[model samples]
Target chain A: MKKVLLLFDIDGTLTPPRLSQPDEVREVIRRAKSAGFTVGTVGGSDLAKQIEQLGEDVFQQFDYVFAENGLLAYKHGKEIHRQNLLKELGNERIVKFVRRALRLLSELDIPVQRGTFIEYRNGMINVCPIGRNCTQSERDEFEVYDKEHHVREKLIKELQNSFPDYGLKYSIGGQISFDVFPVGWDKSYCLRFVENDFDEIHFFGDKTHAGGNDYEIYTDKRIIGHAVKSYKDTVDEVNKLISS
Target chain B: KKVLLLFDIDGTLTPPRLSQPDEVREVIRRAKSAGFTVGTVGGSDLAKQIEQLGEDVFQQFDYVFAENGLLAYKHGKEIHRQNLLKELGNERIVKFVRRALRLLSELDIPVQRGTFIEYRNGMINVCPIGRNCTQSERDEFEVYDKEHHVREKLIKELQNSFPDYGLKYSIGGQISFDVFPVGWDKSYCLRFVENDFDEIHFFGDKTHAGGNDYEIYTDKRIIGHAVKSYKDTVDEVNKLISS
Candidate 1:
């Protein structure tokens, strides 16, 4: 039988943007996994936090979790493989580029919140100009201004220009921040887990827009993009996909 | 030639328990002084290594990775130091370590279990009978370790249980496995090498699953050569440099 694998772009896709998945999604995922279909979730979020939001019933239900934007690939909750940004780019480059990017963020000349600004996720180093500390309300405010002014979009372009030919690409992650990953990395790398055997790989995500984090994966030829708006949409669409 | 030779000091350079032979010493010391940027990373027990290697050959090294990867240095100056405990925090490490141990005991086979936790330098070493194990005490376990693939199962189980940690793990010289935050493997040494990403090369014997060399060998940054013995390493390096 031709196997099928469903990859959910967590955070917004599995749940509803930085929130947990609804109980219905769990029931749907359980049914899907109970069949021959392999199931997994991909996220730019920390793997632990990603696994936590879903709860074990949902978390352990899936066959795999692609954390750190596919740099870390987990199977049966074990990391079977991983990619590294430091490996692609030398440390000297990473250090210098990160330093320059931070300075760039510092020079943005806009009012923003700060959390853990520069973090090394090994595969995709995360750079949040607004910092990760923005609360939901603060994120909403900053995100609105960011979309209007194209603040993050500009940073993405500027960063891309500053470090061209270095195998680095930038993506707007969720609402509050952006990521610096390899040219073809992003959530697309997670497809490696089950793409070979699965006849069709359906990728469910909300942010399939050009600048969104999930944009790259949705664009991947091998992936079947199931772009949706809310968690309910994801659960419903995925159920249909599995049933058909 | 402007090359950085990041090697394993334990078995790559000299044999353990069998004593460090002069031939091995001279080859390593020569490698260090041969003008190539020379450095090596060792599993836990940095101080004992400092004493075993003694000062003469040790001083020639540009840097040595001790305690798995806790302390990385150059010429006695600390260039890279990561607080593994701080990264995970005690509360977090303990929580994850317990889960790993629990999963280990239930691995559907009989292999052995140990005290399960020990901190070295800053790297956390987890083992079967673990660090508290002595050579004589570890005899049965050692015979079964490589044969039964004990470390192999343990590392995978650990990775599965704690994906959030992004931990870097390696197999110990005997009767154990080693782990630290991801990127803290022997390959992390390549970060300090001045050569281009492809220009750097590493050679080791234990380049298999759960072994210390496995991490660097899998690293996409530099080329890795896994040889069976020090003599094999000597042969490979000679062919490598000339080619």
Candidate 2:
């Protein structure tokens, strides 16, 4: 009896962006689990958001839950491991990064600025030149400007130049922000926990392209990658997994 | 002679963005002792007024006008009070807010934050960078604004749109470029003490053209003294009281 794991990316894979997981996706997970497949979910969002999107009883919905890119991990309704940015990078190093980030944000000649330039997370810091507290319209406007100007792209280059050997990876996503975490702390960071426990691992995510959150794990030779376009596509992939 | 020596808070009695220094307080005390009825006016609220001055702000001065005299206190008691909502009415306020929002939405700057439009007792304090920014952020904006004239541009555009609205835009503080009634500058407080004192002398830092203290400083009924520092204010008061 091989232990098989069907892991999923929460946003866009299990549910619409910042939306509740549909019963259709839920039913497939139930079907997969009932047919002797282990079900799990992973996302870049924290557990609180994961709970909101998946369900309050997310641990019950999936056998494994990995949030903050698996820096916080749970298995079978119990906490398995927790990693922190401060612990990984050291306080002095994180403090330096924060200073550099704030300075860069201050020097950034954006059209508009807002508060909360750097949001500290367990595994990473979310940096936004326009600030995270911007209104929806502001966020949308920034996205347009970002595409044309590559604001985050330029900032990432400056940050990389400053910390050449720090081993931190800057990922630009979303409308108004980018994330900075360790090199190996992408969605694949969750794989380390399940590698020995599961005989087969299948990952489904929308952002499986190069430089995307799911890129590392999706390209990894250890797991079977299922690049999905939407939750409807995810449902099809899950059905195939169950039937096979 | 029944004389009144009025003072501006920020940049006159204390450093801008800080509380009153002991020497400045001592000078004000000296002016009061020298038979000059002391008063203070500021664009801030009473709480912020108290924070910048002292808890005994009202008792320390014969009169205190916060929010550019909209919230007036005499001898620690409410003497007179006026509000923008009452003066302008809801319809015009809503229009101004919508207009301001539209203008701010289109404008681009280095940063923008929450609390963009603050409806105060006297004026509508508008900030492109928002009032909720950190102290450092506020300072950064002040510099950025000075170089780029962001606040001035916003005010100009707002004024152009509301040409008949009779709003006076005063670019004050690090971030706020306040919008108030035409006659709602610091001189608004003079109506309270117009007849009570024979001589009204105003000492302020920003007495230059287009500054917040300019209107009152140049008012014909008021004897305006442009002092660069609290010490200069003390000297001007000393010279006035002696004569």
Query: Which has the greatest lDDT?
Result: 2
Cα lDDT for residue B28, candidate 1: 61
Provide DockQ values for all models, in the order shown.
0.01, 0.03
C-alpha lDDT of all candidate models, in order: 0.68, 0.81
Model 2 clashing-pair count? 6
lDDT of 1 at A204: 88
Poorest 10 consecutive residues by lDDT, candidate 2 chain B: B106-115
Error of 1 at A59 (Å): 4.6
- Estimate candidate 2's alpha-carbon lDDT, on a 0 to 1 scale: 0.81
Query: What would the DockQ be for model 1?
Result: 0.01
Q: Indicate which candidate wins on DockQ.
A: 2
Q: Put down candidate 2 lDDT per residue, A94-124, tens digits, no spaces.
A: 6566656655665555666544566677787
TM-score of 2: 0.52
**Tens digits of per-residue lDDT for model 1, A71-120:** 78778877788786656876567655654554566456556433345556
CA lDDT, candidate 1, residue A53: 77
Error at B163, model 2, angstroms: 26
Interface RMSD of 1: 18.7
| lDDT by residue (tens digit), candidate 1, B112-158 | 22234455445665565433334564776777776878777878777
